[PDB]
Amino acid sequence: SVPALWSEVNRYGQNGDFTRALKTVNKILQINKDDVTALHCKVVCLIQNGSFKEALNVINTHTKVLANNSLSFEKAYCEYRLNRIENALKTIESANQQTDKLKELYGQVLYRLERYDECLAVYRDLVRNSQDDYDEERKTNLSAVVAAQS
């Protein structure tokens, strides 16, 4: 039963067990080779366990099937973590749909590129518009941008 497998994936993900979620997702992918949600979860599992190149290889092996349901955030995130900042920037700017996750990464990418004026505008917006457990951290990031300008 593939609904039963998905129930397993969800349970593991909610408990942060991406190692076991990956095993179950791979069983789903044996049944439905082009399930976009399964490929998306596989990418997340790999990123969560530090396997950024493996996650990127999944994305780039399934480009057509993932097109426009796509994981531009995850692809750019892996590129960012793999010291490919220029790739990461292009992936973000090429995304079909802009999201809060993409904007968060975009601020970090602009910081790494030393584009501090644009970075500051992004972080001011991120600080204002975000409601999450990371306001203190995000304001620390904003202060690092202000410091770099001076």
Partner: peptide, 21 residues
């Protein structure tokens, strides 16, 4: 290097899975 947090990592999460049930 000032302290700078990778907050993007906190966004790395499964999509909603209800429909897969």
């Amino acid at each position: 290097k000032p302290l700078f947090f990778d907050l993007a990592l906190n966004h790395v999460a499964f999509p909603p899975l209800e429909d897969k049930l």
